[PDB]
Structures are given as C-alpha cells and as structure tokens.
Amino acid sequence: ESKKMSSELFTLTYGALVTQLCKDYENDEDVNKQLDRMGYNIGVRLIEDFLARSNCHDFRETADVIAKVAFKMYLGITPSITNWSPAGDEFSLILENNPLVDFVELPDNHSALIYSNLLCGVLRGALEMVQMAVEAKFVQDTKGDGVTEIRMRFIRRI
Amino acid sequence: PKTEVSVSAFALLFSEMVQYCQSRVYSVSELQARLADMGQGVGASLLDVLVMREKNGKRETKVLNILLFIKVNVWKALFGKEADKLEQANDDDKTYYIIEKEPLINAYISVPKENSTLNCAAFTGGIVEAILTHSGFPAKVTVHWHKGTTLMIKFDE
Ligand SMILES: *C(=O)CCCCCCCCCCCCCCC
C-alpha cells in the first residue's frame, strides 16, 4: 500500500528547509549536524511505515531492501550496490543524480555543506529501529563529481 | 528525469520542518510565520521554472493572469491538481481568495489528523507570496479557515 506524488513539491520543500537552515545557522557545518538530526527523526518514523507496507537478515540483504525497495518506494529511484567489504561490513549506494535536488538552488558560498545530509540520518535512524547500528555518509555528490555515492557500514547489533 | 515520489517523502519531511519551527517559536501564529518564511525563500525558484517551462518565458503583468497562474500552473505543479476556487472579495477591489475544500496536507497522509492546522497553508502562502511579489505585484498573503482552508491575497494599493 502506497500513494504517489510528483517530485516537484518534495524537492522544493526540502530546498526550503536547507535554505532556511542556512539562515538560522551561520556555519555551513552546523547545518549538516541539524540536517542529520532531522533525518534521524524521520528515519525513526519511516522504518515503521516501511515495515508495515511490505515484506532483512544479514547486511547484504539490507543493502538490497534499501536500494531496491525502500529507496524506490519513497524517493522513486534505485541506487546501485557496489564496493562491498570482505565480511559483509560496508558497501556503497550509487546514483546517476542527487535524489533531493532539482531546480531549487542556493547561492554557492557553501563549500562544507552536504546538501542532502538528511538522507544519512534517515538511514541511520531507520536501521537503528530494526535493531541495527550503522553509519552513513557521502563520498561523492553530483560537488562536481561524476555520480552520488553514500557509504554505509554495519557497526554492531542491538 | 521526471520522478514520482511517495506521498510519504513530503509528509515526513514537512512534519519535521513543522517540529523544527515549533522548537524555536512561542506561538502557533509564529510557527506559521516561520513556515511562510521557508515558503517565500523558494517561491521565486518555482516561478522561474514554471515560466520558462510552461509560459514560453513570459511573466505576467495583469492581475487576473497572475492569479490564474497560481490557481492552475502553480497549484498543479505543487499538488498535482488545480486549486478548487479562485475568487474576488465582493467587498474590496484589492482582495482575492484561493479556497481549498480540504486542508492541503490531507492528500499526503493515510488518515487525516483529528485536529486540523494551517501549517501547510502558511508554507504554501509564503510560496504564493514570493511568486506574486517577484512577478511585480506587491502583496500580503495570509491563511485562515472559512469554507475550507483559505489563502487570502491582498494587493497593496
Ligand atoms: C530490514 O530489516 C529493513 C530495512 C529498512 C531500510 C529502510 C531505509 C529507509 C531509507 C530510504 C531513503 C528514502 C528517503 C526519504 C526521505 C523523506
């Protein structure tokens, strides 16, 4: 069960938040902290909605459910799962483009700003609800890069 | 690449933004003002994208034309539908209304909240306000309940 909408409002609204946080905070980096905390709060609520509206075990499957189901169900896309770790510890999510971006732009004076940092909190918060303590973070952003990459690593069970 | 997002992406995001604003505010009235602020911050971006994409790059200079841009172009782009009603106050030549039958937020949540608010309307009103002023029409946009949720649009004399 899941109702749909166009990206416009969502990306537009998110751009509003980011643009405002840049005013309520004089430091590009304290914005990141807030965006993550905020993402965390959503991730905590999201996991529930998600779980209820569909059908993990080990970390390799979790990556699948995340990039093939979750990411597709909410943000309407499907990142690629590449660059794993010898013991199913760490992986990477690839995107031919930034999911929270389109037509809403901020004056560029923000070099240390991670525009879509909120996604990292969402992931951490969501997983943390399914008894999983992990870590998310960007390592490529469509920042003059070829593609968007989010690195994630299973830290410990709960 | 035109995308389709879950009605939840927005709902969840907006809900946090509301909480954010509420954490640094004293009253609901102030909460809505902050939301309207966030809205005004991006109204212009939406104005330019819709003009260049749906109006051959020509902005509006007449009142009726810009109001229709709001009711049709802007409302569709944001909520997938046209605004329910566009009216002029019969009492004064400088006031207009965008009347929605249901609160804007209800289309993004499984079950409408027991108690209604004007948070999405305030935010939206700020967007509509940036759109109007940035097109050359100095105005004041407010929100309230009357025949559903209303966006009051008042042009400066
Ligand atoms: C396995 O036990 C369940 C794993 C559930 C993972 C859910 C991850 C949610 C993140 C998706 C990103 C969408 C962002 C939406 C922002 C509003």
GROMACS .gro file of C-alpha atoms and ligand atoms in nm:
model
  332
    1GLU     CA    1   0.000   0.000   0.000
    2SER     CA    2   0.144   0.339  -0.105
    3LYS     CA    3   0.014   0.664  -0.257
    4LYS     CA    4   0.226   0.867  -0.501
    5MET     CA    5   0.311   1.228  -0.590
    6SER     CA    6   0.536   1.433  -0.818
    7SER     CA    7   0.894   1.520  -0.713
    8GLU     CA    8   0.848   1.896  -0.750
    9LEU     CA    9   0.686   1.962  -0.411
   10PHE     CA   10   0.917   1.729  -0.219
   11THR     CA   11   1.240   1.861  -0.367
   12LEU     CA   12   1.105   2.215  -0.348
   13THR     CA   13   1.007   2.179   0.016
   14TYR     CA   14   1.341   2.022   0.104
   15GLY     CA   15   1.514   2.311  -0.067
   16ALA     CA   16   1.317   2.543   0.154
   17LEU     CA   17   1.443   2.372   0.468
   18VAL     CA   18   1.805   2.376   0.355
   19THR     CA   19   1.778   2.742   0.251
   20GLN     CA   20   1.633   2.833   0.594
   21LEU     CA   21   1.880   2.629   0.794
   22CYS     CA   22   2.147   2.832   0.618
   23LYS     CA   23   1.996   3.142   0.775
   24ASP     CA   24   1.930   3.004   1.124
   25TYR     CA   25   2.290   2.881   1.128
   26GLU     CA   26   2.591   3.096   1.042
   27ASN     CA   27   2.815   2.790   0.998
   28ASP     CA   28   2.777   2.556   0.696
   29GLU     CA   29   2.883   2.270   0.919
   30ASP     CA   30   2.631   2.310   1.197
   31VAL     CA   31   2.372   2.284   0.925
   32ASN     CA   32   2.497   1.933   0.849
   33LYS     CA   33   2.450   1.835   1.212
   34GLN     CA   34   2.093   1.964   1.212
   35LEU     CA   35   2.006   1.802   0.880
   36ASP     CA   36   2.132   1.470   1.012
   37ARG     CA   37   1.944   1.500   1.339
   38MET     CA   38   1.636   1.588   1.140
   39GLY     CA   39   1.691   1.299   0.902
   40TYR     CA   40   1.734   1.076   1.202
   41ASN     CA   41   1.394   1.180   1.338
   42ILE     CA   42   1.230   1.093   1.007
   43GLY     CA   43   1.417   0.765   0.971
   44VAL     CA   44   1.276   0.666   1.308
   45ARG     CA   45   0.923   0.723   1.183
   46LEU     CA   46   0.988   0.598   0.832
   47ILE     CA   47   1.102   0.249   0.928
   48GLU     CA   48   0.758   0.188   1.075
   49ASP     CA   49   0.565   0.298   0.769
   50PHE     CA   50   0.803   0.096   0.554
   51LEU     CA   51   0.793  -0.228   0.751
   52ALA     CA   52   0.416  -0.220   0.771
   53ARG     CA   53   0.371  -0.159   0.398
   54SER     CA   54   0.577  -0.457   0.277
   55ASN     CA   55   0.780  -0.774   0.343
   56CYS     CA   56   1.610  -0.822   0.634
   57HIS     CA   57   1.860  -1.066   0.789
   58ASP     CA   58   2.225  -1.007   0.711
   59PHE     CA   59   2.383  -0.683   0.589
   60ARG     CA   60   2.398  -0.791   0.225
   61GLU     CA   61   2.019  -0.825   0.210
   62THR     CA   62   1.968  -0.500   0.394
   63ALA     CA   63   2.153  -0.324   0.114
   64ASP     CA   64   1.911  -0.483  -0.133
   65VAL     CA   65   1.597  -0.386   0.059
   66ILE     CA   66   1.735  -0.036   0.090
   67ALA     CA   67   1.842   0.030  -0.270
   68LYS     CA   68   1.580  -0.183  -0.449
   69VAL     CA   69   1.270  -0.142  -0.233
   70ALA     CA   70   1.290   0.142   0.021
   71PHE     CA   71   1.479   0.386  -0.198
   72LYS     CA   72   1.239   0.306  -0.478
   73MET     CA   73   0.921   0.325  -0.269
   74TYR     CA   74   0.995   0.664  -0.113
   75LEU     CA   75   1.232   0.855  -0.337
   76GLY     CA   76   1.128   0.682  -0.659
   77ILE     CA   77   1.473   0.557  -0.761
   78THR     CA   78   1.712   0.264  -0.736
   79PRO     CA   79   2.078   0.317  -0.638
   80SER     CA   80   2.346   0.059  -0.725
   81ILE     CA   81   2.507  -0.153  -0.454
   82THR     CA   82   2.881  -0.165  -0.524
   83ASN     CA   83   3.216  -0.184  -0.343
   84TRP     CA   84   3.149  -0.430  -0.064
   85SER     CA   85   3.369  -0.540   0.225
   86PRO     CA   86   3.525  -0.889   0.275
   87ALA     CA   87   3.289  -0.978   0.561
   88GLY     CA   88   2.964  -0.809   0.457
   89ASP     CA   89   3.054  -0.500   0.658
   90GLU     CA   90   3.049  -0.200   0.426
   91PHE     CA   91   2.901  -0.104   0.089
   92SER     CA   92   2.815   0.184  -0.141
   93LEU     CA   93   2.500   0.331  -0.292
   94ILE     CA   94   2.534   0.484  -0.636
   95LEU     CA   95   2.312   0.738  -0.808
   96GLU     CA   96   2.337   0.895  -1.152
   97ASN     CA   97   2.200   1.203  -0.977
   98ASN     CA   98   2.120   1.368  -0.643
   99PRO     CA   99   1.775   1.248  -0.524
  100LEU     CA  100   1.689   1.558  -0.319
  101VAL     CA  101   1.791   1.804  -0.590
  102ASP     CA  102   1.625   1.973  -0.892
  103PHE     CA  103   1.569   2.340  -0.988
  104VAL     CA  104   1.596   2.476  -0.629
  105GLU     CA  105   1.947   2.625  -0.589
  106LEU     CA  106   2.126   2.802  -0.305
  107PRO     CA  107   2.385   3.071  -0.356
  108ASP     CA  108   2.708   2.865  -0.369
  109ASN     CA  109   2.908   3.020  -0.077
  110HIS     CA  110   2.867   2.680   0.097
  111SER     CA  111   3.176   2.463   0.046
  112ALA     CA  112   3.147   2.247   0.359
  113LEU     CA  113   2.774   2.192   0.314
  114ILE     CA  114   2.639   1.844   0.245
  115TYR     CA  115   2.313   1.943   0.071
  116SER     CA  116   2.145   1.602   0.114
  117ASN     CA  117   2.297   1.511   0.451
  118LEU     CA  118   1.946   1.444   0.585
  119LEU     CA  119   1.947   1.112   0.400
  120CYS     CA  120   2.229   0.991   0.624
  121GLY     CA  121   2.024   1.048   0.934
  122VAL     CA  122   1.720   0.885   0.779
  123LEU     CA  123   1.920   0.573   0.706
  124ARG     CA  124   2.082   0.561   1.050
  125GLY     CA  125   1.754   0.625   1.227
  126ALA     CA  126   1.559   0.373   1.022
  127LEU     CA  127   1.809   0.091   1.054
  128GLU     CA  128   1.861   0.168   1.422
  129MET     CA  129   1.491   0.091   1.463
  130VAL     CA  130   1.530  -0.257   1.319
  131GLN     CA  131   1.794  -0.327   1.585
  132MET     CA  132   2.085  -0.227   1.359
  133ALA     CA  133   2.353   0.027   1.445
  134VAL     CA  134   2.515   0.160   1.128
  135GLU     CA  135   2.684   0.466   0.983
  136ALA     CA  136   2.604   0.665   0.669
  137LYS     CA  137   2.786   0.941   0.485
  138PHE     CA  138   2.853   1.098   0.147
  139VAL     CA  139   3.169   1.042  -0.055
  140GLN     CA  140   3.059   1.178  -0.391
  141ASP     CA  141   2.799   1.436  -0.490
  142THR     CA  142   2.666   1.536  -0.832
  143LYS     CA  143   3.007   1.886  -0.589
  144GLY     CA  144   3.137   1.845  -0.943
  145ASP     CA  145   3.154   1.464  -0.921
  146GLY     CA  146   3.051   1.204  -1.176
  147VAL     CA  147   2.789   1.047  -0.950
  148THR     CA  148   2.642   1.045  -0.599
  149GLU     CA  149   2.780   0.790  -0.354
  150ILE     CA  150   2.671   0.712   0.002
  151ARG     CA  151   2.899   0.491   0.212
  152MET     CA  152   2.745   0.271   0.481
  153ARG     CA  153   2.895   0.034   0.736
  154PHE     CA  154   2.738  -0.206   0.983
  155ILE     CA  155   2.876  -0.114   1.326
  156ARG     CA  156   2.705  -0.355   1.568
  157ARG     CA  157   2.386  -0.537   1.661
  158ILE     CA  158   2.150  -0.407   1.931
  159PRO     CA  159   1.419   1.299  -1.537
  160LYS     CA  160   1.062   1.342  -1.410
  161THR     CA  161   1.021   1.140  -1.093
  162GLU     CA  162   0.741   1.010  -0.877
  163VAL     CA  163   0.787   1.013  -0.502
  164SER     CA  164   0.587   0.852  -0.224
  165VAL     CA  165   0.330   1.081  -0.070
  166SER     CA  166   0.522   0.999   0.248
  167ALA     CA  167   0.851   1.160   0.148
  168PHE     CA  168   0.687   1.502   0.168
  169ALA     CA  169   0.463   1.432   0.469
  170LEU     CA  170   0.753   1.305   0.680
  171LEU     CA  171   0.977   1.593   0.574
  172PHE     CA  172   0.718   1.862   0.631
  173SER     CA  173   0.627   1.716   0.967
  174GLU     CA  174   0.989   1.754   1.080
  175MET     CA  175   1.006   2.108   0.948
  176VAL     CA  176   0.698   2.190   1.148
  177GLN     CA  177   0.861   2.048   1.458
  178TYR     CA  178   1.178   2.235   1.381
  179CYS     CA  179   0.996   2.568   1.362
  180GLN     CA  180   0.793   2.483   1.669
  181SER     CA  181   1.111   2.426   1.869
  182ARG     CA  182   1.223   2.785   1.827
  183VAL     CA  183   0.890   2.960   1.843
  184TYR     CA  184   0.648   3.087   2.111
  185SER     CA  185   0.307   3.058   1.949
  186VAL     CA  186   0.131   2.880   1.662
  187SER     CA  187   0.093   3.217   1.498
  188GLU     CA  188   0.475   3.248   1.497
  189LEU     CA  189   0.512   2.891   1.378
  190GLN     CA  190   0.307   2.964   1.070
  191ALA     CA  191   0.508   3.281   1.007
  192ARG     CA  192   0.828   3.082   1.005
  193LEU     CA  193   0.677   2.824   0.771
  194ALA     CA  194   0.558   3.103   0.544
  195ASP     CA  195   0.918   3.227   0.553
  196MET     CA  196   1.057   2.896   0.433
  197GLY     CA  197   0.797   2.907   0.158
  198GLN     CA  198   0.890   3.255   0.040
  199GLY     CA  199   1.253   3.152   0.022
  200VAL     CA  200   1.183   2.916  -0.269
  201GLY     CA  201   0.877   3.073  -0.431
  202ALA     CA  202   1.094   3.254  -0.685
  203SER     CA  203   1.265   2.934  -0.800
  204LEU     CA  204   0.926   2.782  -0.872
  205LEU     CA  205   0.822   3.097  -1.053
  206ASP     CA  206   1.114   3.082  -1.293
  207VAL     CA  207   1.085   2.711  -1.360
  208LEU     CA  208   0.715   2.731  -1.442
  209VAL     CA  209   0.750   3.039  -1.662
  210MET     CA  210   1.036   2.905  -1.873
  211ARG     CA  211   0.871   2.564  -1.891
  212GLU     CA  212   0.501   2.644  -1.932
  213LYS     CA  213   0.480   3.009  -2.036
  214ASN     CA  214   0.740   3.039  -2.314
  215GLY     CA  215   0.940   3.258  -2.077
  216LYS     CA  216   0.687   3.539  -2.044
  217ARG     CA  217   0.596   3.671  -1.699
  218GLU     CA  218   0.256   3.820  -1.621
  219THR     CA  219   0.171   4.188  -1.591
  220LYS     CA  220  -0.204   4.176  -1.528
  221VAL     CA  221  -0.374   4.074  -1.202
  222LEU     CA  222  -0.619   3.820  -1.347
  223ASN     CA  223  -0.341   3.647  -1.540
  224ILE     CA  224  -0.108   3.607  -1.245
  225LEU     CA  225  -0.387   3.483  -1.021
  226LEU     CA  226  -0.474   3.215  -1.279
  227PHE     CA  227  -0.105   3.123  -1.291
  228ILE     CA  228  -0.140   3.049  -0.922
  229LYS     CA  229  -0.468   2.856  -0.945
  230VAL     CA  230  -0.363   2.648  -1.249
  231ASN     CA  231   0.013   2.640  -1.316
  232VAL     CA  232   0.140   2.672  -0.959
  233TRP     CA  233  -0.124   2.465  -0.783
  234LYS     CA  234  -0.093   2.179  -1.033
  235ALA     CA  235   0.288   2.173  -1.017
  236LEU     CA  236   0.280   2.155  -0.641
  237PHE     CA  237  -0.023   1.938  -0.564
  238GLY     CA  238  -0.098   1.756  -0.890
  239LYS     CA  239  -0.430   1.936  -0.914
  240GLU     CA  240  -0.578   2.276  -0.984
  241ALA     CA  241  -0.695   2.495  -0.695
  242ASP     CA  242  -1.061   2.434  -0.609
  243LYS     CA  243  -1.160   2.802  -0.626
  244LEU     CA  244  -1.035   3.144  -0.720
  245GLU     CA  245  -1.247   3.436  -0.608
  246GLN     CA  246  -1.251   3.807  -0.564
  247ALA     CA  247  -1.380   3.960  -0.248
  248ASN     CA  248  -1.704   4.138  -0.332
  249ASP     CA  249  -1.625   4.395  -0.060
  250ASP     CA  250  -1.299   4.533  -0.195
  251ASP     CA  251  -1.124   4.552  -0.532
  252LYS     CA  252  -0.787   4.459  -0.380
  253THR     CA  253  -0.861   4.119  -0.219
  254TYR     CA  254  -0.866   3.769  -0.370
  255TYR     CA  255  -0.902   3.414  -0.240
  256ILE     CA  256  -0.764   3.068  -0.315
  257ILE     CA  257  -1.011   2.836  -0.144
  258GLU     CA  258  -0.930   2.470  -0.086
  259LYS     CA  259  -1.208   2.233   0.017
  260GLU     CA  260  -0.973   2.018   0.230
  261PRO     CA  261  -0.653   2.106   0.413
  262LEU     CA  262  -0.358   2.074   0.173
  263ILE     CA  263  -0.179   1.825   0.395
  264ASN     CA  264  -0.458   1.562   0.390
  265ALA     CA  265  -0.362   1.436   0.043
  266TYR     CA  266  -0.026   1.317   0.177
  267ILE     CA  267  -0.133   1.122   0.483
  268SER     CA  268  -0.322   0.794   0.514
  269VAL     CA  269  -0.565   0.927   0.773
  270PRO     CA  270  -0.648   1.296   0.824
  271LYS     CA  271  -0.544   1.423   1.167
  272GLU     CA  272  -0.819   1.452   1.427
  273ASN     CA  273  -0.735   1.819   1.470
  274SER     CA  274  -0.664   2.043   1.176
  275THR     CA  275  -0.398   2.313   1.137
  276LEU     CA  276  -0.285   2.575   0.885
  277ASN     CA  277   0.082   2.482   0.866
  278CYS     CA  278   0.085   2.357   0.508
  279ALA     CA  279  -0.132   2.652   0.411
  280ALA     CA  280   0.106   2.901   0.573
  281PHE     CA  281   0.408   2.746   0.396
  282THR     CA  282   0.220   2.747   0.065
  283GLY     CA  283   0.105   3.104   0.122
  284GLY     CA  284   0.468   3.209   0.152
  285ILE     CA  285   0.537   3.039  -0.181
  286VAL     CA  286   0.244   3.212  -0.345
  287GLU     CA  287   0.364   3.538  -0.193
  288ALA     CA  288   0.716   3.510  -0.333
  289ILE     CA  289   0.563   3.422  -0.667
  290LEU     CA  290   0.340   3.733  -0.667
  291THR     CA  291   0.593   3.987  -0.542
  292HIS     CA  292   0.869   3.851  -0.765
  293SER     CA  293   0.638   3.898  -1.064
  294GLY     CA  294   0.585   4.262  -0.980
  295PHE     CA  295   0.272   4.254  -0.763
  296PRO     CA  296   0.342   4.370  -0.407
  297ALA     CA  297   0.105   4.172  -0.187
  298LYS     CA  298   0.029   4.021   0.150
  299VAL     CA  299  -0.075   3.658   0.176
  300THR     CA  300  -0.248   3.512   0.478
  301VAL     CA  301  -0.422   3.191   0.571
  302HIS     CA  302  -0.737   3.105   0.757
  303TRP     CA  303  -1.042   2.884   0.785
  304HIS     CA  304  -1.362   2.972   0.601
  305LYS     CA  305  -1.540   2.736   0.361
  306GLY     CA  306  -1.233   2.516   0.394
  307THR     CA  307  -0.877   2.642   0.406
  308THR     CA  308  -0.828   2.987   0.251
  309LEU     CA  309  -0.531   3.176   0.114
  310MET     CA  310  -0.614   3.543   0.135
  311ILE     CA  311  -0.433   3.750  -0.125
  312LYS     CA  312  -0.421   4.123  -0.069
  313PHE     CA  313  -0.260   4.353  -0.323
  314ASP     CA  314  -0.103   4.675  -0.198
  315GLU     CA  315  -0.281   4.993  -0.315
  316LIG     C1  316   1.531  -0.464   0.701
  316LIG     O1  317   1.518  -0.528   0.825
  316LIG     C2  318   1.457  -0.332   0.678
  316LIG     C3  319   1.547  -0.221   0.625
  316LIG     C4  320   1.470  -0.091   0.603
  316LIG     C5  321   1.559   0.020   0.550
  316LIG     C6  322   1.482   0.149   0.527
  316LIG     C7  323   1.570   0.261   0.474
  316LIG     C8  324   1.493   0.389   0.451
  316LIG     C9  325   1.573   0.493   0.373
  316LIG    C10  326   1.518   0.518   0.233
  316LIG    C11  327   1.555   0.656   0.179
  316LIG    C12  328   1.431   0.739   0.146
  316LIG    C13  329   1.447   0.884   0.191
  316LIG    C14  330   1.312   0.952   0.214
  316LIG    C15  331   1.329   1.090   0.276
  316LIG    C16  332   1.196   1.153   0.316
   0.00000   0.00000   0.00000
